[PDB]
Amino acid sequence: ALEVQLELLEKELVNTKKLSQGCNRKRKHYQMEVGARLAEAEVKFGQLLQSSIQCRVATL
């Protein structure tokens, strides 16, 4: 009876293990989606930063 009682607990350890890794798995994609979009924004940010300068340098 004690062996039937034990195996049931470790089945729930697995069910929790799978859904825990499954939630983290969805988060990972979101992180990589936006982290790229932030990288896109910063590149464009640095382009203006120097573009606005090189316009003003020539105007003089």
Added chain:
Amino acid sequence: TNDIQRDLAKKALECNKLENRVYDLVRSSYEQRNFLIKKISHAWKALQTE
């Protein structure tokens, strides 16, 4: 009191024989059953953290 000393002798000798016969068979099955109980205490403790 002497009637009990006969009983204490006769009965406890039977008890020690019954105990040591059981113990030889059941101390092994105790360890089997008791080491299995410790597995619930760890199977539970991990369950909560998960």
